[PDB]
From a paper:
Tau amyloid fibrils have previously been established to adopt many distinct conformations across different neurodegenerative conditions.
Tau PHF and straight filament (SF) structures from the 63-year-old case were determined to 2.7 and 2.9-Å resolution, respectively, establishing complementarity to AD tau filament conformations at high resolution. Cryo-EM helical reconstructions using RELION resulted in well-resolved PHF and SF final maps at 2.7-Å and 2.9-Å resolution, respectively. The docked atomic models for tau residues G303 to E380 were in good agreement with the map and confirmed the tau conformations are identical to the AD PHF and SF structures. Indeed, alignment to the AD structures showed no substantial differences, with an overall α-carbon root mean square deviation equal to 0.5 and 0.6 Å for the PHF and SF, respectively. As with AD, the filaments adopted a characteristic C-shaped fold comprising a β-helix turn (residues 337–356) and an antiparallel protofilament interaction interface across the 332PGGGQ336 motif for the PHF and residues 317–324 and 312–321 for the SF. For example, we expect that the cleft of the PHF fold in DS bears an identical pocket for stacked small-molecule binding, as we have demonstrated with the positron emission tomography ligand GTP1 and as Kunach et al. demonstrated with the positron emission tomography ligand MK-6240 in tau PHFs from sAD.
Numbering used by the authors:
A (entry chain C), B (entry chain A), C (entry chain E), D (entry chain B), E (entry chain D), F (entry chain F): 304 to 380
Write the structure that this text describes.
């Protein structure tokens, strides 16, 4: 017995943007209050966390485009 | 017995945008209050979490386009 | 018995951006208050964490494009 | 003709307070936003004013008692 | 003609306070935003004013008592 | 014609306070933002003013008592 696998996916996909001007962007928050109370924390594998935060983000990319692609080929005998 | 698999998907897909101007964008929050109370936290594999947050985000990408694609080819014997 | 695997995915994908001007971007927060109270913290493998934060980010990339791609080929006998 | 005025008001009035303890007082505001827009202001005699304010006051007097008294005696001929 | 005025008001008034303890007083504001816009200001006699303010006051007097009194005696001929 | 004025007001008024302890007083503001914009200012006699301020005051007098008194005696012929 013989097994042949040919894995040849072809990609020609374009993700693109055009813009004239980014322009006036104003981000003026007036800060509040946050309180968190806890006794014990206990984190193990691959935990990702935020506790007690007051964060402001202004994010103005000129493009900001994304292309996420994953190829997988498991085999067994 | 022989098994032949040919995996040749072809992609020519375009994700694209055009814009004249981004223009006036104003983001002016007036901050509130947050309180969280807890005794014990216990997180294990692949937990993702936020507790007690007061966050503001302004996100103005000029394109902001996404293309997410996944290929998978499991095999067994 | 013989097993042949050919893994030849072809990529010609472009992620691109064009912009005229980035322009006026103003980020003027008015800082608040944060309090966090805890007795014990206990973190193990691959934990990623923030506690008690008041952070401001202005991020204005001229492109800001991303292309994330992963190839995997497990085999067994 | 003769005019006699005797002005002899007698005051023995007490304004008083007693207290055991002032105790726990917490004042935790989360700041908002204020905007005021105007072209021209024009103020004359005895004007008292506030424009565009975000103020917090905690006032805990141990007594805090007031006694306001006014005596007046106009005369004409 | 003769005019006699006797102005002899008697004051024995006490304004007083007693307190055991002032105690825990917490004043924790989270600062906001204020904007004021104007072209022309024009103030004359006895004007008192505030424009564009973000003020916090904690005032804990041990007594804090007030006694305001005014005597007036106008005469004409 | 004769005019007699006797102005003999008697004051025995006490303004007083007693306190055991002043105690824990905490004043922890989180500073905000203030902007003021103006073209012309024009102030004349007895003007008192604040523009564009971010002020914090903690005032803990052990007594803090006030006694304001004014005597006036105008005369005309």
């Amino acid at each position: 017995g013989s097994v042949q696998i040919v894995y040849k996916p072809v990609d020609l996909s374009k993700v693109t943007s055009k813009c004239g001007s980014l322009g006036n962007i104003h981000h003026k928050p007036g800060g509040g209050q946050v309180e968190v109370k806890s006794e014990k924390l206990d984190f193990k594998d691959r935990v990702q966390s935020k506790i007690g935060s007051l964060d402001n983000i202004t994010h103005v990319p000129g493009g900001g485009n994304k292309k996420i692609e994953t190829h997988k080929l498991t085999f067994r005998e």
